[PDB]
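Input:
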Amino acid sequence: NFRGHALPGTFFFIIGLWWCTKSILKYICKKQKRTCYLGSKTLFYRLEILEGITIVGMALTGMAGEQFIPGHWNQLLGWHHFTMYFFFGLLGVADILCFTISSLPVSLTKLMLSNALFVEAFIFYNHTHGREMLDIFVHQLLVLVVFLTGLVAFLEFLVRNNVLLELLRSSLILLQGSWFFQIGFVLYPPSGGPAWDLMDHENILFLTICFCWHYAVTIVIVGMNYAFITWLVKSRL
Amino acid sequence: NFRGHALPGTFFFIIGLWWCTKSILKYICKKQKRTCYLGSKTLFYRLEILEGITIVGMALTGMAGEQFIPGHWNQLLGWHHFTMYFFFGLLGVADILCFTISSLPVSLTKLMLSNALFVEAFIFYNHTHGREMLDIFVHQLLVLVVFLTGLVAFLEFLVRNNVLLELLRSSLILLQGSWFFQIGFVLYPPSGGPAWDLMDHENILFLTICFCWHYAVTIVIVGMNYAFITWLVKSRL
Amino acid sequence: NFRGHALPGTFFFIIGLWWCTKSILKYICKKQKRTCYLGSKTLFYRLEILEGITIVGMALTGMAGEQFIPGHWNQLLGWHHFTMYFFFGLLGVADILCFTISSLPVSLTKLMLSNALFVEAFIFYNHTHGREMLDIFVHQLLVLVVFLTGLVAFLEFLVRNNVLLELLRSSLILLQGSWFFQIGFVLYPPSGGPAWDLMDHENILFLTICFCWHYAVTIVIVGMNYAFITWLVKSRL
Amino acid sequence: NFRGHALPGTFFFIIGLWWCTKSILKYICKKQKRTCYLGSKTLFYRLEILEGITIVGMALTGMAGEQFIPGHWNQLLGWHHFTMYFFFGLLGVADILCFTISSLPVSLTKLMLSNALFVEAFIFYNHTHGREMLDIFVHQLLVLVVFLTGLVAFLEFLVRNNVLLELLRSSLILLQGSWFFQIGFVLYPPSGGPAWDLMDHENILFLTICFCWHYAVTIVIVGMNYAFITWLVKSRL
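Output:
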């Protein structure tokens, strides 16, 4: 189960890094005088097509991996992950269609993303039924992060071309990935032996501070990525 | 009671399909060069008048059907449906008046719609008092859907001419209708014998996934309708 | 206590009627070709000054009436009404200052109004501590109405010159007044003898429908007032 | 602990006064005809640099003072204050960087501020675990104030150059400082002996009215500051 928690963390980390890099590069191209390094739009179209294809492929891979099998109910918990992966694949297909046919509005993709996020949150609001207070609290924090990311995505859809909103969305995605890794490390330690008790208000207090530190680290990572891309553009110019 | 649950499902399904078709046709007419096929505005006015008349008629029919009868309280539950139908009839009358007199703003109708939705949600927040956890959970999901549809309608009223928002509202209406049908099928099976226990967390988990699948199906239906209307316009041209 | 509940109902009813009439007259003046009947702005300034003076006077009168008296705590419940009246008086003073000095923005008054409403809601969220479920439910409905009115006022402040928003705010004020009268009639019947039991889910269900009917009646009253003002303008022209 | 509560109150009071003065001066400069008294922009740049430096210094001082020390958990409560001070220092550093490099958007600083506020609220939602109902209620009021201030800051970030929004944010900051002082005076009286019982609904009712009075006092202080700055500008001119 540790791998099952860790894989989405890597996926979200990669997606957030790619989106942040794309947004910074687009802003730099807008600031750019001409098509010397980034003005070409065919490169952007190819990057969008590749992004959609990779999202669809990752969704399919996650769906296949989660489903162990290639009038009753069994292993019902995996169907939630199945549905989440299906929604992300629908988002990828919608992005591919939008960037393939010019008639469809560009922002539609963003809308789809928001929808997917909301769906995920809804599922995570009911995925846990029993279990201990620590697990419940951690899953509620994950739900809060997903809901905030969905709200930010919807607001970005409403307001066209907001670089700060895109950076905030990327930071939230990175925070979600880091928190998924934290969930994995806490619930299923790789050391083999349990380390954190499931009933400790001290653990809850420490987890709150850890979540805040993760958010701060994601903000710092976004800033460092912006600085690195600026340095690379300056060196290229 | 199964018929009483099923009839609003059909009404909402028809209304959502009609609204989606109208929005797609309006967008196509805007993209159209001239009045060759859809540029005429008298057709739109006639369609709006017919839509208002049909909404008023359906509200009256539902009110009459719900009321079995043509200092105490009896059959108090039916008065809630009476009030909901009355509010929908008020929305229809307001739409007719707005499209009859040019002085009134067009968006007023939208506002009225939002109000009606909110009222419905409020009623459904108190309609159920006793009953089992499964029924309570299903009615709470219905309340959530109605509240989200009302918020989307209000936002559409605030922001003029958003095709994506109109499509989202139509998809939400279709989801509401499908969930009404699901409520009917679960609470009062047509088979005569009970099938689903009223106390099962497994049933709750399955219902969450069923709701997500219904939302996905509605999105797919909206996409297919858009494709079909595009095909029809291309064939006509 | 029945008079203490009824007086704010009359105040809110009068204020809502005056605001609705003012908004409709302003819209008609905007539609008007010239200063034949309503184009004069000195009339609007005089009306605003009179409105501010009347609001301040009503706030002072309510404060004086509520306070029976012209290291411990006694009659602490009246201080809440004192604070609400003080906030409304501050709103009136702010409106007078804004319409007296041209430097201050016009929308500031609206903002103040919103603030006052929010404060009222907050107080009504803690005014009731004990008491029965019926009283708690009715006060919670009043809190909901006040919160919705405050949100509508804030949104109107954000978006300049929205006639529909002003009409919605007026309808909400009228609904608040009617519900205050309902609270008075239910809690302290004028007949002398108690009529409604304080513990009845049937009473709760009836009160929900009564609230919906009050909202519908307020909407109808707003529509009738608009029609009457249109008739009067047409007759004058 | 009384000093630990009181110091942030003084910090917030000073920051709110400075921000209100800056906003009023900026509005007066905009109304000003030329650079006679305030048109110079180098003064604004120097003031912004000084504000950032002072914010960073105060954050560092608070962090050092809170940390008594220059596989277990001890004094975990202080890490929350450490994190809050770290976030405020990050806000100050971001403001300094934004006013140092022209490429970065100006509103970014505002965004950062909002983020910090939200983080603080989150921490204060979990800082208290045990304790009595009075302390819980007071901390919940503080959480509400912080959340409202964060929402106002985010809305100000969304809508450029709103003087009323800036004044509202300053008033909320002053209210937060005054309520911090109230918390200090109630929880840890300077008289040495306890005065307020920790379990009294009368105390809760009095605290609600005290909070409303604090809000009113902050509004009056903002108005007086505006009047004083107007008088000073008129005298200088």
